[PDB]
């Protein structure tokens, strides 16, 4: 019966491929050709947040577009004040192996995780005056590589055991666990409506999950290597996957296949962070080649290079108001571009 | 600056605190520890599901010893966390080819082309007893030589050392009897040799 199941799976995959290819009447390039070019985008380092003493592995802007939290393997998660470079908090992590960070939309909680297999939720607004752990969420069998807050109560974490789970910080138990990936789920990005999300895995696929029912609605493929980062389009109907094959593709949820690819001959390093702009026109994607290319999300051509880092950029984040983009590289310096 | 002056005071207080913690943590020496399962990883410094962090002090150095064998995932996705370790300690069970393949994979990784690998060959006496009854041809079909403990140990050591190609890294092979308490001294002297080599590199003279 295994042969019959394999044949049925192959037939279903062929049907999916035929359906996806049947709807591609016209590609994005020949439609966007009628739009004028965005022109060269020049950006200057307005701020530089010195203070970290090790490689920075995450950076998430607060919902107020002013508070930036950075996680580094020095054992600290410093919450910066981007307007005046000041440091608000310096949270000493339990363990020094941190690969992700998060900031609550309300600003009360800050998450953290890494090789510890534990996603810790810190309490910034404690009455005692200090920042203390509120719930050390545990239950994963691999490194937690990305965590995001749907709200102050429920968090979704992406692990390296082919599993993304939605926790409940109030009780500390996996409310819903999403499975179906083949390799490590190395990235995650919640939708603007927070009712669904995508997770780019090491198996060159970015599955579209659903938070409520815990079922993968759609799956996307087309990459030749692992997916290191992923982010929704501002509208929520599209997302961009930053692969490790020196390319990044813009998928469409309703169309259900890749729309444009952003590749350049002069680029060989792997992407580590892809983030859109407020209007979705720009795609400020970081690279391991020490730079951070800005791509026109429609014309699929470069519009500027944010070359100001002496090491590989491990994170990139555009604020909610769109007035600043911050890149944190391994040289311990997070620079706020504009 | 109405009360932002007080905010600057808090920023300077923790900025100095970060600097004080940074210099204190710089004295520690980090040693990534690898090897096959049940290969003697916990019987080298015996005298003194996530990651396992072991720290001990010897001759005014804080040796931090991470045993990352507890991660049941792909090495490549978290091996860049240990990019800046002083050295890699490798434990090989001589009483049992998987270790050789793992050594080949880890000794030529793009992030470990400049980090030397300290190699430990554990179970020397058990290996000798096994050789006295069973030959090395079983584990190494290409072995052609005398059936003696010393020759077989030298052959295995040469095979392990032959898997590197970067001339900027060195393998400090050493054999333990699973009972000697002096392995800490061997780790210390290998680490200090690596440190002076790195210092010579940093002075533009190595």
């Amino acid at each position, epitope marked *: 019966e295994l042969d019959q199941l394999r044949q049925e799976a192959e037939q279903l995959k062929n049907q999916i491929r035929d359906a996806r290819k049947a709807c591609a009447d016209a590609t994005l390039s020949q439609i966007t050709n009628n739009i004028d070019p965005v022109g060269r985008i020049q950006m200057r380092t307005r701020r530089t947040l010195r203070g970290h003493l090790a490689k920075i592995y995450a950076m998430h802007w607060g919902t107020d577009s002013r508070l930036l939290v950075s996680a580094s393997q020095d054992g600290k998660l410093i919450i910066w004040d981007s307007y005046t470079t000041n440091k*608000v908090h310096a949270i000493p992590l339990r363990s020094s192996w941190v690969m992700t960070c998060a900031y609550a939309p309300s600003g009360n909680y800050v998450a953290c995780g890494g090789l510890d297999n534990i996603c810790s939720i810190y309490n910034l607004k404690t009455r005692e*005056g200090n920042v203390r752990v509120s719930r050390e969420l545990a239950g994963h069998t691999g490194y937690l590589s990305c965590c995001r807050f749907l709200d102050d109560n429920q968090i979704v974490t992406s692990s390296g055991d082919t599993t993304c789970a939605l926790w409940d910080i109030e009780t500390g138990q996996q409310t819903t666990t999403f499975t179906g990936h083949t390799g490590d789920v190395m990235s995650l990005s919640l939708a603007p409506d927070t009712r669904l999300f995508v997770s780019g895995a090491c198996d060159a696929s970015a599955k579209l999950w659903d938070v409520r029912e815990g079922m993968c609605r759609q799956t996307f493929t087309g990459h030749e290597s692992d997916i290191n980062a992923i982010c929704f389009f501002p509208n929520g109907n599209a997302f961009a996957t930053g692969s490790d094959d020196a390319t990044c593709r813009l998928f469409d949820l309703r169309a259900d296949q890749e729309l444009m690819t952003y590749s350049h001959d002069n680029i060989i390093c792997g992407i580590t962070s892809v983030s859109f702009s407020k209007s979705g026109r720009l795609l400020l994607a970081g690279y391991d080649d020490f730079n951070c290319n800005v791509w026109d999300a429609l014309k699929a051509d470069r519009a500027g290079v944010l070359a100001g880092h002496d090491n590989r950029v491990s994170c990139l984040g555009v604020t909610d108001d769109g007035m600043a983009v911050a890149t944190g590289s391994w040289d311990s310096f997070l620079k706020i571009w504009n | 600056s109405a009360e932002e002056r007080a*905010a600057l005071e808090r920023s300077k207080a923790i900025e100095k605190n970060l600097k004080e913690d940074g210099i204190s943590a710089a004295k520690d020496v980090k040693l990534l520890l690898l090897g096959a399962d049940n290969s003697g990883k916990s019987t080298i410094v015996k005298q003194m599901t996530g990651i396992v962090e072991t720290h001990f002090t010897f001759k005014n150095l804080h040796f931090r010893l991470f045993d990352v064998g507890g991660q049941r995932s792909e090495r490549k996705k978290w091996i860049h966390c240990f990019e800046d370790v002083t050295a890699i300690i490798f434990c090989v069970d001589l009483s049992d080819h998987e270790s050789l393949m793992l050594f080949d994979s880890i000794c030529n990784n793009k992030f470990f082309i400049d980090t030397s690998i300290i190699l430990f060959l554990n179970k020397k006496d058990l290996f000798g007893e096994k050789i006295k009854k069973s030959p090395l041809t079983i584990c190494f079909p290409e072995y052609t030589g005398p059936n003696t403990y010393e020759d077989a140990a030298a052959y295995i050591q040469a095979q392990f050392e032959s898997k590197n190609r970067s001339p900027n890294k060195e393998i400090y092979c050493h054999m333990t009897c699973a009972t000697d308490t002096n392995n800490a001294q061997v780790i210390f002297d290998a680490v200090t040799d690596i440190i002076i080599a790195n210092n010579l590199r940093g002075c533009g003279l190595y």
Partner: single-chain antibody
Amino acid sequence: DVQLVESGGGLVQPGGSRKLSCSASGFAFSSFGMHWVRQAPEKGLEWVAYISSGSGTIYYADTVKGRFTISRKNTLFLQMTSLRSEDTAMYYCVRSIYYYGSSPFDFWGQGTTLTVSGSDIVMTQATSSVPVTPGESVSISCRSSKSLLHSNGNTYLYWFLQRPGQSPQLLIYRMSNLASGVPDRFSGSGSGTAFTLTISRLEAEDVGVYYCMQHLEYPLTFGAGTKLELK
């Protein structure tokens, strides 16, 4: 939970000395800049001293400088030398932490009574007594000689409610935000010079004295104190 208890009162002859100690427990006292606020028997609160985190800076009032000394095992000490006739007051130990989004003057100590035998920002409250009935709405006004709206957009007008026989509690901080633990009935407003604390559906537990404060520059000057008495 959080408590700031203290002692060191008693009758003091004029010209003597007395040590007032603030015992702090239940919070990270090492990162809090504790103030000192005194209250005359029949007058409003007046600022006395302030010591920051790590004792970086210490400030004293105009009529206190030199005579007193404030220093900080989780305990704050205030030295009193050359006491005058106007030093008869109840002294409150007030904590305050300063960063973006912080809540200065959030907690006030129990306080101990102690008796003996021009360019500052002066702030006045137009009304001193407003008799209102429960279930209605009341509004207390506060003015200032100099505009408190700083360049960075923050206006510094802290509002305090002092229930009879109880230490004051923070109600509105920075003239727009609401202190934690305060019912949503209270709401601040105003801009530049004129401030207003609007209370909607006033309850029987909202009676007391409301004090208007600024934090633009030391010394910090409280208001005259408006009393919202029942009926």
